Design a protein around this ligand. Structure first.
Ligand SMILES: [Mg+2]
Ligand SMILES: [Mg+2]
Ligand SMILES: [Zn+2]
Ligand SMILES: [Zn+2]
Lengths: 589, 589
DNA sequence: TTTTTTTTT
């Protein structure tokens, strides 16, 4: 009756964007440039342009989608005839569907229609190949005939061989020819519901999703995704009877998105403020009163330094923080916020974690009895932040397992005939209590901390928190009561904007040390060593690691302002913050 | 369409190398002399000669390799008819394909094409036999007929039996005839992607490869390889249905490289410089300031001594080094460099290693239920170097398991009805911290080291590193900042050249001890022992092993300069380095 | 059962 082929073509070439630039024309041209084969379409734009087409897509997806894909191919084909013989067909993916269903609310009425699901990826299988059009040869001394079996039909997910030879009308034995068989990429992944959606008491549930063609390897485990596609039932051996007419549910993904130009200008405008550093610092844990030096230190760990990769060695660029404090000083509240604003973070505790779970585990799969590696907490946090609450409660024989990952940023395993090395480039933030629960001033600093000097040298900054009831109790009491009353602080960057800001900085900014910063850093390091040698009593050691901590911190300060060079101003701040760190552990500079 | 037989023969006989020596002519003669049945052709040579031929090999590989193989066979057979009846057919292997694809980015479009993958070898199976042309016998009271079942076609990967007897056109049951069956060698290996190309937060992937004919047993596990061949889908159980329309992929290897005259010329001229020893020492860990004695000791372990094999016993020729130091003294950075410059090295840590994993593991195969052995780190490092970081962090019950491999260089297993003895000729490099993290000067050496005297006696050299701040801080700070600023030290042999130099020295050099060096070593050992008896409380003991250490070190010094005899000078250097080791551990000389 | 890495009484 009505053809949407023209409307779809009209929509793509005639659609004014936010800045009136025909964004979809630009997207198509970018697709031809690198042969992307996949085009992303916003549902809202289709609804804004022509509503009638929008309902057709969301309600008749299984029919109208192949029609649009063919129409798009011709339009691209006209733009570039050379697009052939490298790409044979394209894919149209739709995002922004309003039909969002919780993973626990799926019922029979939701099967067969395009829906959207939000969850967490937990398992990804290696990419494999699926046959969708096989080629067979009849093994019968008369035939020697080659044919494609699923004629006029895509081969189903259950393989089936012909029973009668089409070219001779005889039964017999058929042989598959891999050379003439058509294949498509295939990957299986498992999604899990968010903890915020799990009801009280029960464990989270899981759903199986299938990724095909270019959708494979689109995300890594631990990511938060929004999948869109068609639900369907799952079968393994339909021929194998014995009742059991009960089937599971699997999700046939058509478009996946993880976690725009408008953000860049929004981010770029933020960096133009001269007081951007102070605004960022004041935006860390707005619900916590005071602890200005601690808030500043946590900001540095989020940005980090510049890792240096050389032809012979590599230098760690991550910043590690240690906090020791009396109970009730909001150590854990701050760590919770960090795991929320960090683009990638893993939260663990000292008691609830083991040496094998922190780095890597060797397990025997019951399917084959063969040992294989399992990623640990530090490995999964690669490129992110690892948070280790209650570090003092962790067994010492287990805590030593992270010494290598803290400095060399690798995990080495030699167990059960498996020798492997895994990257663990993650920043470690840890908190804990002193030896006797509360800090005791009479005893020396050495026995209060109760940690080996080997692990203390691996932390760039160490802060000791003391809860002394003084004149600020009234200020603290009023601040807390305001939080419980719903009153909040304004003129602070929200979490979502801040998370976008940090991710941009860690990807496009790489400061360089200038000569002016070199002299200041060198002079202060020499001063450190002389002071430390004078008093060989403090439990901390001024090793060459402390010199590199100055370099890492200096780059982080420059990175927070999206600067390209480490000026003298950043060097002074880096020296200043470590002066406070040294004062905390009782070293007077 | 033009015949390429003449062009291929023309290229073989008329190609001029760097010296215009007709290199491939020499290769054919070597092939004829040794009956090697395999030819290696560099792709870039073919492209330079005839670009049209090079393209055809890349693209039309399925139906052009047998054509060239036949043409080459006739040329060889014409050259020497005696080559026939010894070699039925020859193989042409092409090396240097421009099409290189990472293991993780293989898609359906790459199946059926000649591609190159570079990875790490992991597992190798014993050589087996594959039937490529069967010979059955229709046993039926009237038939008694035998025949080659797959007619005018190679036997497929799937074992299939005839249904109708060709000699009588009747059904029945058939019996295989092993005597008349044709077989071909067959080996299965597993390759793994390199650690430097694994994406962040993910475990490495694996690919299955198949080696046939002379390609079997071309490499050992742990080797870095570059394989070239055709990808294909893998079929395991296609007789029974049940979906499973998803297939894995494997590789049909055509040519394999592991890890020349020009290099040997480069190495030879390097040793001509009288100061070659100092150049090599200065080239060890260029990013680390100072530690000249440590750098020199590490160079010796790279080269090693001369193992002696006698009719009654054998004496090890490897050098073991132990480093004890305060945290932050860059012990791990040097060990990382050693694992990268050595021709063969295995890197492990104290905490991430087990007694079974270091030497050998007994694992029960689930398929058959019988135990079998798996090679540990020391076995895999045979003929190379084993690096054990954080030696003091492993449990003493596990550390004691390497006493035999450290001296006798063998691993003995009496477990689960398996009695075996494996060679573990590997040099051990170890590092660790003192008992209290940092070295305590007031306490003696016995309580600082915290290791049993048995394992200490097995180490040729022991160096204690102390981090004392002093006047060298300013130069140390400047050196580190220059490294971070990108400045590089010149007059340094690069890693690749240095690795080639070490491999050549360990292979073609075997120094002999002269009389002059004999007298010097004897006098020092006697004088060393006499002073040892004066203070018997030291944890170190001057056993007869230390006499062997002097011999091994002296040979290593001679081997560093590609000398053939241990002159007087090399004995002097060996004594001096021993004095530093003794003086460092607290024994004056 | 017997050897192995792992969390658990
Ligand atoms: Mg807490
Ligand atoms: Mg170390
Ligand atoms: Zn037929
Ligand atoms: Zn017959």
């Amino acid at each position: 009756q009505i053809d949407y082929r023209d409307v779809f073509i009209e929509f793509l070439t005639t659609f004014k964007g936010n800045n009136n630039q025909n964004k979809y024309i630009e997207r198509i041209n970018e697709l031809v440039a690198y042969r992307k084969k996949s085009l992303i379409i916003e549902f809202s734009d289709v609804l804004s342009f022509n509503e009638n087409l929008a309902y057709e897509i969301i309600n008749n997806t299984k029919i109208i989608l192949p029609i649009l894909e063919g129409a798009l191919y011709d339009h691209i084909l006209q733009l570039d005839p050379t697009y052939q013989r490298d790409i044979e067909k394209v894919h149209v993916r739709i995002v922004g569907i309003p039909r969002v269903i919780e993973l626990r609310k799926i019922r029979s009425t939701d099967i067969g229609k395009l829906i959207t699901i939000d969850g967490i990826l937990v398992k990804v299988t290696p990419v494999k190949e699926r046959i969708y059009k096989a080629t067979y040869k009849h093994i019968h001394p008369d035939c020697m005939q080659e044919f494609e079996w699923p004629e006029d039909e895509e081969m189903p997910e259950v393989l089936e061989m012909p029973t009668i030879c089409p070219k001779c009308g005889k039964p017999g034995q058929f042989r598959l020819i891999p050379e003439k068989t058509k294949l498509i990429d295939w990957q299986k992944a498992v999604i899990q519901e968010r903890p915020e959606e799990v009801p009280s008491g029960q464990l989270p549930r899981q759903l199986e999703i299938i990724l095909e063609d270019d959708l494979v390897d689109s995300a890594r485990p631990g990511d938060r995704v929004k999948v869109t596609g068609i639900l369907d039932i799952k079968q393994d051996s339909p021929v194998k009877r014995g009742s059991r007419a009960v089937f599971d549910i699997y999700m046939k993904v058509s478009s996946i998105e993880v976690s725009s130009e408008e953000d860049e200008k929004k981010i770029k405008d933020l960096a133009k403020d001269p007081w951007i550093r102070d605004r960022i610092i004041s935006s860390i844990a707005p619900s916590i009163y005071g602890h200005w030096e601690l808030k500043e230190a946590l900001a540095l760990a989020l940005f980090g330094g510049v890792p240096k990769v050389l032809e012979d060695t590599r230098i760690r660029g991550d910043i590690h923080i240690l906090i020791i404090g009396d109970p009730g000083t909001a150590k854990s509240q701050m760590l919770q916020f960090i795991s929320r604003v960090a683009p990638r973070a893993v939260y663990t505790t000292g008691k609830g974690s083991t040496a094998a779970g922190l780095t890597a585990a060797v397990v025997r799969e019951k399917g084959t009895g063969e040992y294989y590696l399992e990623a640990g907490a530090l490995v999964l946090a690669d490129g992110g932040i690892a948070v280790i609450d209650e570090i003092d409660k962790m067994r010492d024989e287990d805590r030593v397992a992270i010494h290598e990952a803290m400095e060399q940023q690798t995990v080495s395993i030699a167990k059960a005939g498996i020798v492997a090395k895994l990257n663990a480039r993650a920043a470690v933030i840890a908190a804990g209590n002193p030896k006797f629960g509360r800090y005791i001033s009479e005893r020396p600093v050495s026995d209060n901390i109760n940690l080996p000097p080997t692990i203390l040298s691996r932390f760039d900054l160490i802060f000791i928190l003391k809860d002394q009831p003084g004149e600020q109790d009234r200020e603290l009491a009023n601040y807390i009561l305001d939080v419980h009353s719903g009153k909040s602080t304004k003129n602070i960057i929200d979490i979502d904007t801040l998370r976008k800001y940090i991710a941009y900085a860690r990807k496009y900014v790489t400061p360089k040390i200038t000569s002016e910063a070199k002299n200041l850093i060198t002079d202060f390091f020499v001063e450190m060593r002389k002071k430390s040698s004078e008093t060989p009593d403090s439990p901390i050691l001024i090793t060459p690691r402390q010199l590199e901590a100055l370099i890492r911190i200096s780059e982080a300060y420059a990175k927070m302002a999206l600067k390209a060079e480490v000026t003298r101003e950043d060097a002074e701040r880096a020296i200043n913050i470590m002066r406070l760190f040294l004062e905390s552990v009782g070293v007077d500079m």
